[PDB]
Design a protein around this ligand. Sequence first.
Ligand SMILES: *C(=O)CCCCCCCCCCCCCCC
Lengths: 221, 146, 191, 184, 210, 179
Amino acid sequence: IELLNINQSTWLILQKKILQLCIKVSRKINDFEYVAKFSSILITKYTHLLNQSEQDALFKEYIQPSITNESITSYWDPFILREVVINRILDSDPTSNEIPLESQEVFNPFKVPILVFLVGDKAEFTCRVQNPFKFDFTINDIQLDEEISEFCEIDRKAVSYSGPYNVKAESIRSITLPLIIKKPTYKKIYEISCLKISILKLPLQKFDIINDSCIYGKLKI
Amino acid sequence: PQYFAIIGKKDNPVYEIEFTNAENPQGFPQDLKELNPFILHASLDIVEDLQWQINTDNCYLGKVDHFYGLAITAYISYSGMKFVMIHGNSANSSVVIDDNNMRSFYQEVHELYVKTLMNPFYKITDPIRSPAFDSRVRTLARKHLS
Amino acid sequence: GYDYDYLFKIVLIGDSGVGKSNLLSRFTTDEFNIESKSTIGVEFATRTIEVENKKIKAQIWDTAGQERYRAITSAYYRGAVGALIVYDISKSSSYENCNHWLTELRENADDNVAVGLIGNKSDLAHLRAVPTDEAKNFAMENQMLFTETSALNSDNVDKAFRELIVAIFQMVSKHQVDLGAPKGPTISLTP
Amino acid sequence: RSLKAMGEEIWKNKTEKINTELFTLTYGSIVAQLCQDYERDFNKVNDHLYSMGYNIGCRLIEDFLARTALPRCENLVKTSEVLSKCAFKIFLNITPNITNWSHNKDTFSLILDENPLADFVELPMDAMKSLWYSNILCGVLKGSLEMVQLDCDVWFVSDILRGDSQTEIKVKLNRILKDEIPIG
Amino acid sequence: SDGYEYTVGPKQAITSETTYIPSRIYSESLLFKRQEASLSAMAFLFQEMISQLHRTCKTAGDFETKLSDYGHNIGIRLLELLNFRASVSPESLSNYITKMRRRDLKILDILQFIHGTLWSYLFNHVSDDLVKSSERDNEYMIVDNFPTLTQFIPGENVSCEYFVCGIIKGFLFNAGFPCGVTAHRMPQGGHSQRTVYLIQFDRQVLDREG
Amino acid sequence: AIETILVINKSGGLIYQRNFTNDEQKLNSNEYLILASTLHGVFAIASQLTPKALQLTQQTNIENTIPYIPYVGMSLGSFKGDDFFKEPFTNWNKSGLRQLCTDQFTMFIYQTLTGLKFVAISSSVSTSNLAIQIADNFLRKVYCLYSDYVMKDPSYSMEMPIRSNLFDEKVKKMVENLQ
Ligand SMILES: *C(=O)CCCCCCCCCCCCCCC
């Protein structure tokens, strides 16, 4: 790998073929370490050169056992979950609940939303998860932060009853959840983009928020 | 058959193609199909070595490298573009390269590269993704290569 | 002393009898020829100011037309970049003409011209024939600065004038950036 | 001679020439980097090139009309004749034709027989329906004819690079604003 | 559809099988069609492009790099093509040629080529008095008595001339000769519109040459 | 013997006051602004003074053409050849202040079609028509130099004060030959 520039040359087909032989030999020897470490590189860098057949084969053969044997303790891309939008539902008429207001010169004319929740109004947390690969995985569970933790979290039993969230091959599939609130904030606007997720029974890894292109789309509560 | 490629200074291909002869239209059987990029990458080193030397024409290098019956020929243009190709047997021969047909082939392919380099939207790193270029190169291959 | 980088033309346009002649007489570089208002239509005042290291020269032309000046009074706004609409808070007649004055200004002068509106002689509190509230509301509807002035209430016109120029500068200032030689014998390699 | 032999002589021996492959390569570099800078938003690319051409023309009207000093055009005929036969002739070796005069005589079309700006060009496949390549020409036309107090609108309707054989520039006079200095 | 498609790899093309498309650029030859135009158009494009970079930039270094990059995209296209024309000895152009200009693979040959052919193409007259300073270790330099492109640009400072600097920078970079080319102003000979493009080569080439 | 020139952009306002005198320096820089603007205003106001005899009936579109003085300039930039032009041309300001003659000097005016004005103060006092014919040609050479070296300038905003060295040295070369 050092002879090439896997980690001066940009022959992606050749680099893919070398990485394929590398993982194949690493599995030929009883070494579950570099098989994992190179499969991660192969299916994070050269993901738009493998056809569906080889991608499915590689995922079922060399990456899935890497999941089972606790070889990798993270996820491959940071580009998952483009959109993280949140809202509040008005089940009754608008008048039922309203937001408090919280109570000889010279003129010249030549010179984002702040989400609000009362304390317990039922909210709605909709996140759009994008699958770039040619195989379909599943999300196990979702969590928020430590800084804004225990403030407006999603309900653990709710997500558990909802069960594992499959995501299709190339989709931008959405997940909608309820959201409980249990603490006030007085006057201190707090951000929400830490957003821990588990994927395929892995440890809950942090994932930031990324729009269509790099700009961090932050909303705050 | 034959397998021809155009490669830039950063050692990435901007074009690759393979020509049969209609007797065995699957081309190189199954293993040389996998082995073409690596043998050509090997030959690239010798092409680079001859790139900067003294010794008449020096754009056309002719037979530069050898392998299991593969004749590897190369041509260097002015921007470091390397036009390199490998000729194989018809499943049994001691294949030899023409001295003028491939010369003129590289002359016209370099003509095509020169005139498709000029347009402002084409960068050196990006590949030559042009159906007109592909059609012109293959109809040239029919006329000159064999 | 041609040190100024830019030269902005501004018209002190206003109604007759408004006291605008006394208005511009305070802030001046008063020298040279004077009393040229009746000579053609105009009298001239100038000033150099510093605006983040770019010296700016101003040209106050005080156009006036009584009964005969119809075409040239409009032609003097060929390339005017500022306006200083002068009115007086003593009679509604002077303020009533501001709509026509602005209409002619926008029709003839440069497109999207900066316009201020100055109320002369605000010391007189006995004949306030128009309220500052209505004047401010009128100022809102055109994106145009407003002020009222008096001899005793000094510095107001000066600060408004400077702020008008620095407002115009942001519009007609294209951004300007402040844009080891080989020493020794030589040998000629030409063929 | 009305305009033909006049402009022919002006271009023949009064002008300092220069190779135009330099000119077209320069313009190609500008319009190539514009796409990368604007992230392939070809509508805004066209708008930026329009501003480019307008800023060109606002100055260019002082070079032409000083190198020839033609009399003031009256109405939509001699102005078209100069604009076709001398204005483009002095600055480039092209004599574009005039076509499809409207019924009311308020619009006309320049046929650009040759376009030295777009000499060696292929637009990318994903931009052969939005990008007007030589929008700088429309910009300079609009700026010049506005500065002669002949305010008008200029646009494309077809280009040789995109599809159709003929390459067009539609020029429509909006209004002759009557603020042309005191007497000119 | 039949393009290269670098993701999938080299497609299989049968030699025996042929319907060409009207590309409109590959069919158009490039022999030497002379269509010389006025210097005024070039000058107006030059000053407007400078003005647009002048707005976009924030400092002298930004203006430096941006104009150099703008000129760097012309040398890339000139290097192949000008040599290719010079290969012609007095329809497909390739059926009028037997051998090419070799490669100008030497430092002196490439620099002499820019002295002779490139400048004669660009400004219609060969450049004057190519020199190398034999003082520090190596400092080549090409001097012009009257730069055509930036002639109208006033001011004793020289920064709007780097268009040509980028042209030579690209021409040398694509030929396997990295450089740090930069312009300087020096009146010597009563002209005072005299400009020296200093070429400063890199250690790779310095080791390569000997 | 032209001693001074000055040019007015489109709406008044001096933008060039390079004085071609040995050593006079009597007039302040500031008052030339009033000079140029007053000349502009007088140019405007003389337009509506055509006598009514010629107001309704001019019939004089044969004299507007101006003849070609051969080598008024000297003995180039964007232009090339022995001289900036060879043919005669036409007058543009046919109802405006063209000349102001005076015992000690003479002020010639040349108006560009777009609106620019060029003013030439000459100490020399030519039957008052040949003087105009010399002056219009010379001022159009100055206008050609202006279009060459002020319009094709990046660091020059439109209709603003002129600050250049090519332009001033070139017009100085132009005038030092014309005497
Ligand atoms: C009658 O009123 C005379 C009008 C004169 C109009 C002149 C039009 C000039 C257009 C020339 C465009 C040349 C292209 C330059 C690109 C840099």
